[PDB]
Amino acid sequence: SMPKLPENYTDETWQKLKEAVEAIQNSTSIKYNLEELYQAVENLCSYKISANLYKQLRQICEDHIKAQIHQFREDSLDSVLFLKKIDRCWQNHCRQMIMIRSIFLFLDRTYVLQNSMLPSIWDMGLELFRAHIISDQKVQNKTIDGILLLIERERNGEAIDRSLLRSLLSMLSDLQIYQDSFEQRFLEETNRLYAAEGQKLMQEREVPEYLHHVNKRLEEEADRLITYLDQTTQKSLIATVEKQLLGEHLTAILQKGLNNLLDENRIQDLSLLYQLFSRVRGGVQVLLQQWIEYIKAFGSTIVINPKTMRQELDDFKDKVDHIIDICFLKNEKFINAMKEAFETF
Amino acid sequence: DETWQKLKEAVEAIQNSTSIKYNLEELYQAVENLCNLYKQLRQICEDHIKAQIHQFREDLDSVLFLKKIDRCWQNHCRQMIMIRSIFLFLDRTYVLQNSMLPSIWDMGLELFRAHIISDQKVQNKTIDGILLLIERERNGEAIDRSLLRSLLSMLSDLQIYQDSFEQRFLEETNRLYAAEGQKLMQEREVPEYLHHVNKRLEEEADRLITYLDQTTQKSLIATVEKQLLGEHLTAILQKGLNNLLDENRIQDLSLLYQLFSRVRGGVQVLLQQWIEYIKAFGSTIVIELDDFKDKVDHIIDICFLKNEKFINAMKEAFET
Amino acid sequence: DETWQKLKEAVEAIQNSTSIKYNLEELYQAVENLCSYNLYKQLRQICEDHIKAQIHQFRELDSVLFLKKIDRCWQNHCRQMIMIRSIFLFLDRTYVLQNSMLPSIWDMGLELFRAHIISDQKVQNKTIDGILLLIERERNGEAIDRSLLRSLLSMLSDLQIYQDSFEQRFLEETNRLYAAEGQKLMQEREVPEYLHHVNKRLEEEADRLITYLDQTTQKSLIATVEKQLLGEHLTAILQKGLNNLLDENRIQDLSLLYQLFSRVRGGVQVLLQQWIEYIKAFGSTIVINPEKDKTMRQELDDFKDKVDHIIDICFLKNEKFINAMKEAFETFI
Amino acid sequence: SMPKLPENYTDETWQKLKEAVEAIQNSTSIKYNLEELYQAVENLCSYKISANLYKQLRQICEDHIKAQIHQFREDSLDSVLFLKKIDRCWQNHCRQMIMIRSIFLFLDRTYVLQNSMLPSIWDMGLELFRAHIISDQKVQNKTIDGILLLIERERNGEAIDRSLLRSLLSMLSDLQIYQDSFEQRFLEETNRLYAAEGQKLMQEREVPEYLHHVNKRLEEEADRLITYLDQTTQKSLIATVEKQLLGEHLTAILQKGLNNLLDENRIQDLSLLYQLFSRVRGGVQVLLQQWIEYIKAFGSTIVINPEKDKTMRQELDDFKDKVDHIIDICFLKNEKFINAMKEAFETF
């Protein structure tokens, strides 16, 4: 049993706001001065029910957003051009919703809706954009497929628009669907790519070149993470790269290349090896075991194929002490390993 | 094996609350030497937690049951904090190596959730008991708020407060206050009803501060507001507003305005009845105007906080 | 030049709440052109110019009318900044897409409002004094605009000066008011009425906290109320009222007493000790000066039943009180 | 008047806990079964005041921590060995406090201290460690100097213990002094190093090699950030590297190398150039302006000074094709460069 709103005729006040919002939506002129609109909002929450004005605004927002779906059926459109079109649609939505939020600030801030479980105006916009644009199965699949394809291209050496990618993945975070839509597939595809890369390059390249490559990839993925992914992806991503390029090959690497690195006294590469293996569960342990093996095999070759035995031992001890000192950072475990291994001969 | 056994015995001692028959240094060393160890620790943790389920089939008085859950929760926490101290090296190297395995502490929570609180019988009995204590409190009984704080806090730590407890809690609150609103609106005059509604809002604020989670705040207060005021706005004004205004009851009018201000449509419905009152009373004088204007100005000023909307309504009404 | 002017005029329209006499597309384009060929500094400056100008109205004044004027100024500021943010969204986002240390447009606005309006010593003091006065009035029974208060305190939080400006003074004033209230009402009122009052105040302050204060104030506020109304009077309360509550079997009040004392350091402990004392004294008076109309056995059973019931309902079956009671009984049974 | 605590004699109950804590502190045996200690804590909060038991525990914690300062006067000790000593001390502290926290869990969780402003047992331990060990001017300066030196060494190509560095910087975060003690100096030092590196390498190396180097450094610093620094350092750090290696040299890079990159058709390098300049305020704008200049200049030569080999229509088509291709691959089809080029073409 409500009161009559002060206005010249029924619905005058709401109409002004309807027209203002449509102007915002079509990017034309707002043909009222702003004070009048702020007042309109204040009157409509004072004499009528706030929850109703919110429903009215939600509806005209929904009508417009629903209408923006159609531009995304124009396939088979170029993948990048599609992603740009989604981004432009996202920017226009955000711009419009921020402006609407300014006009209706009183509604957002109202004491009566303190306790309401109705989303804020901004969040209401996000629900609508999620529900009607990005949740559509065809649009989502094409958007996510395009994002993943850009990352794949970059990992293969191509130049892409990282800025476009940042903007899209950031949209996915604002819509709270980054984890669901994008992240699991991204980690799946990263797992598949680096599993295959690990196995392929471990045949094609010698250990020193492989380790240099693994280091580059870890630095690259850090840079991807900093530049356009969400921080919540960091542990998973690095763990995946570490696992596929190092974890799966720890023993193979050592078997193929450790003897050569140690025989040939390759200090820089030995340092790198130790840094990389330090990143993975079991790494230093597996290294330490093969180190014991190398050291034991050398003593057997001294006693069997000796010009002087003491001198040959001293030379080896010096070389190996030095490697422990610089490449393995003075790690006591390697010193002990070595002393135990020496007692074998 | 010798080394692992020491840690196995240590952990069992922690689990049975008996003596740790090694000096701590020796244990720290044992952990450092052994760095599978995580899986071994997980397993002996799981074995013990699984074994704690059986005490909850002995059903038993609701409060005694909740205390038994709380004790089990405290012992679990205590034990896991202590295990975590001994195995700190394992936690930190797992953290220094990027592992996707949960920390020791979190591993404990998954096990407690999975084996104790997730069980349908235990969960239903725990949540039923919590809800019963709140209901009893709302009825004027004294309960152990401390027990309640501790159990709800457990539900937050296990990350199941929203799922298990909160929806049922809001359901039960909705039911209780729906029925209270209808009952007391018949039994009590408006002044006494409004005083009561104010008490309930203050009480529920207190429950919230003292033992519930902040994420329950909006929902809870909105429910109390909706059921005690929102559903009765028009009936309250019809039953009591003419008397409050005729009799110049300023304190009650202030309270009315404060309460109605909290609820959708409240001030609006009040505003409309205000216009009605002024038109009717003003019509009876014209069929003295200064005395009425003074009375009315004073109510606007004190009870309605100088609200411009009521000043305008009144000026328009006087032009009748 | 030409292009910047359009944006300067638009922003001035927003600031004076008049009409924006360009269509929005043209403005969005103007912002995009100006970044595609200092603009942030220019926008900061025209924002600052306007906000600076809003100080003058606060040199005039009734406390509530002053606070309303501050609130209006805050709402307009927010409204204007949100709208400016819409037009210049491209600038915000390509600052965010470029790693910049410059605050967002929105945050830039908050720095300016803090610096020019609320940070002024006279305006801040008058604002804080008014806020404190409204809370004091409310605590004294007066009806105030909670909505105004919520809005102003929430402004203080957005400007990140709630802890500095308001909260310490608020806790000081609360401490003072409840210290004096505790001492005054402990003289004026019997224990049952005092406890009922303390409970009301705790419920009230919970409500103030929920309704308009920041959650960070919760622990401090409730501890202060607890300390001044209960902590400072635990012994005096028991001395003045515990014998009457127990003699007269006042179960509701005993329940409340236990609930309240449970909230405070030393509370249950001091209660427990006086409980032991009561039982020893009362028990001794049964065995020494028995009532003629009961048998000795009946009198002792009656007392045991009364006491068991109090433990059970008022003290929540607390084992410590059961033990204290059994021990105490052996002093006479 | 407080009640009498159930115990055989005054202070029996507290003594058990005092001995328990000392055992924890010296890493020896806890000579009571744990149940008895848990009970002791509960009794002391039930019959006596919680706040007092907390003060007592704080004091015996403080006494021990204060005593751990002296090992850090053994200078002039090797920087790494010092840092390892600080880390060991930090681990022991943490270990001891977690275990003390287990015994006194009831005290931490008590309802009466809900409203207390007293820090949790754990946080109490952090205040004490901060106040007595890491806050000491000599210890802090040596700790921070050593951390900064390890980073500097890493940037210069040496292998360091990143794990040690992660653990120490993480301690600094737990003690809430990462921003104060470390971060401002770290950004100062990073600013100084890369300002110098930018100026030095921009003389020593041609543009292609410089850009490749800058790219490496940005990838490296990302890796440092991920591996041992706090995330709150990310924006500042990258901005600094970007500013000193690219921002300060945008014009110089283009003036030294852009004509060559374009004349010689160096597509890979042009792609990298665009990616790097895209990271910096003004980057693409400055690149766009020089692009216009190149196209006007080269086009003006393609009409005033013809080649004998082709008609000049062919020479223009060859140039258009080259330039379209660069826009397409190096500049990612950027409309701004298409327009710039069309405008520039209308000049000749």
Features:
75% helix; mainly alpha; 5 helical Cullin repeat like; 345 residues; elongated; 16 helices; Cullin-4B (chain D); homotetramer
Structural notes for this entry:
4 copies of one chain form a homotetramer. In chain A, helix 8 packs across helix 9, helix 10 packs antiparallel against helix 11 and helix 10 packs across helix 13. Chain A is elongated, with a radius of gyration of 32 Å. In chain A, 75% of the residues lie in helices and 0% in strands. Chain A folds into 3 domains: 132 residues, 5 helical Cullin repeat like (Up-down Bundle); 117 residues, Cullin Repeats (5 helical Cullin repeat like); 96 residues, 5 helical Cullin repeat like (Up-down Bundle), CATH 1.20.1310. Chain A has 345 residues and is mainly α. The first copy, chain A, has 16 helices and no strands. Chains B and D meet through helix 2, helix 4, helix 5 and helix 8 of B and helix 2, helix 4, helix 5 and helix 8 of D. Chain C: It is found in: Cytoplasm; Nucleus. Chain C: This is Cullin-4B. Chain C: Belongs to the cullin family.
